[PDB]
C-alpha cells in the first residue's frame, strides 16, 4: 500500500461503461466502468462535459478520489456526477481512449 | 511511440514447434496485456490468448490450446508464442497486439507455411 | 464463449454510399465492442472503441453505434480508400472473439 502524502498517476489504459449509466432519484448519475490495464492502482479521470473540445468541466465529480485498486486486469470501479440540468456528456479517462455517453438532465 | 515488432519461422515441417516473437518498445509493458490473433488466408481474425506481462497471467481460446502457449520475459518487454504439433491447417499470418478494449498496437504480422 | 455474427460477408457500394456494416453478438456485451477495418498485407487498424468512440485520426465518415447485442459501424460518403474488410470485436469476457468480418468492394 501506497505510504502517506502520496497520490496515484492517471490510469493509463482503456474503460468501457459495464452498463448504462443509471439517475438516481435526486437526479445524479451512478457509473460503473471496467479497466483493461495492469497499471492499477491508479486515479480514475472522470468528468461531465458540453463541449467535447474544450473538454472544460460542467456539473461536478461527486466521488472524493475515484481509483481503480486493483493491479489486475479488468477490473471495476463505481462512480457518481452530478449532471447540470439538460445535456451533457459523462466522461470518463483521459487521452485516446477516453469514453463518453451523452446524458440528459430533466427537470 | 508504441511499436510491436514480431520475428519468427516463417516455413515449417508437419509436425514442428515454431516460437514466435512479438518485442514491444515506447510504452510500459507491464501495463497492458499482449494478446495473438491469427487469419488463414483469405479468411478473418481469430483470438488465440492474451497475456499479461505483468502478472503473466494467460488466458487461451480453447480452440488453441495446446496448439498455442503464450509466455512473455518482463526484463526485455518481449512477448513469445509457440506454435507445436504443426499441421498444414496452421498455415496462417499471426500477429501480436496490445491489449486495450480494441487494439490499436499490432505486429507487422508473420506468415507460416507448413508442409511436408 | 461469445459469438459475434456479422452476417454480411460482402458489401458491394458504390463511393458516396452510406455503408451500415452490421454486427450481433450472442449474448449482451453492453457496449464492450470495437471496430476495425484491414486492408491487404497490414495489420487491422482500429476505427471504433467501446462502440461508439471513434478514435483519433480516423475520418468522421465512420461512426459506430449499438449496445447490448446489436452494433453497427456506418460509413457515410464512402471513399474508394474505404475499401476493406472490417471486423466487430467484443470484450466483455475471454476469448475476445471477432465476428466474421465484412469485406466492402465497389460496385460498377
Known amino acids: 500500500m501506497r505510504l502517506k502524502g502520496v497520490s496515484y498517476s492517471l490510469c493509463t489504459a482503456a474503460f468501457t461503461f459495464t452498463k448504462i449509466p443509471a439517475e438516481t432519484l435526486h437526479g445524479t448519475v451512478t457509473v460503473e466502468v471496467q479497466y483493461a490495464g495492469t497499471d492499477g492502482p491508479c486515479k480514475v479521470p472522470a468528468q461531465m462535459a458540453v463541449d467535447m473540445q474544450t473538454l472544460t468541466p460542467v456539473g461536478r465529480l461527486i466521488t472524493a478520489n475515484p481509483v481503480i485498486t486493483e493491479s489486475t486486469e479488468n477490473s471495476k470501479m463505481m462512480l457518481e456526477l452530478d449532471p447540470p440540468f439538460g445535456d451533457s456528456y459523462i466522461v470518463i479517462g483521459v487521452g485516446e481512449k477516453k469514453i463518453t455517453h451523452h446524458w440528459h438532465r430533466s427537470g | 511511440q508504441a511499436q510491436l515488432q514480431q520475428s519468427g519461422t516463417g516455413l515449417a515441417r508437419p509436425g514442428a514447434s515454431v516460437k514466435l516473437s512479438c518485442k514491444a518498445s515506447?510504452?510500459?509493458?507491464?501495463?497492458?496485456?499482449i494478446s495473438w490473433v491469427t487469419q488463414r488466408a483469405g479468411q478473418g481474425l481469430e483470438w488465440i490468448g492474451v497475456?499479461?506481462?505483468?502478472?503473466?497471467?494467460?488466458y487461451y481460446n480453447e480452440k488453441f490450446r495446446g496448439k498455442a502457449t503464450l509466455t512473455a520475459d518482463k526484463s526485455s518487454s518481449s512477448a513469445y508464442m509457440e506454435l507445436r504439433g504443426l499441421t498444414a491447417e496452421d498455415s496462417a499470418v499471426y500477429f501480436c497486439?496490445?491489449?486495450?478494449?480494441?487494439?490499436?498496437?499490432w505486429g507487422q504480422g508473420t506468415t507460416l507455411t507448413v508442409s511436408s | 464463449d461469445i459469438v459475434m455474427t456479422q452476417s454480411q460477408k460482402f458489401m458491394s457500394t458504390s463511393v458516396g454510399d452510406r455503408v451500415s456494416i452490421t454486427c450481433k453478438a450472442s449474448?449482451?456485451?453492453?457496449?464492450?465492442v470495437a471496430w476495425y477495418q484491414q486492408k491487404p498485407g497490414q495489420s487491422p487498424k482500429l476505427l471504433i472503441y467501446?462502440?461508439?468512440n471513434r478514435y483519433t485520426g480516423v475520418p468522421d465518415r465512420f461512426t459506430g453505434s449499438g449496445s447490448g447485442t446489436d452494433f453497427t459501424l456506418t460509413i457515410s460518403n464512402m471513399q474508394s480508400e474505404d475499401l476493406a474488410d472490417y471486423f466487430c470485436?467484443?470484450?466483455?469476457?475471454?476469448?475476445?472473439?471477432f465476428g466474421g468480418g465484412t469485406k466492402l468492394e465497389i460496385k460498377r
Open positions: 497486439a496490445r491489449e486495450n478494449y480494441g487494439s490499436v498496437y
Open positions: 515506447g510504452y510500459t509493458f507491464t501495463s497492458y496485456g
Open positions: 497475456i499479461y506481462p505483468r502478472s503473466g497471467n494467460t
Open positions: 449474448q449482451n456485451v453492453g457496449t464492450a
Open positions: 467501446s462502440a461508439s
Open positions: 470485436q467484443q470484450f466483455s469476457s475471454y476469448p475476445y472473439t
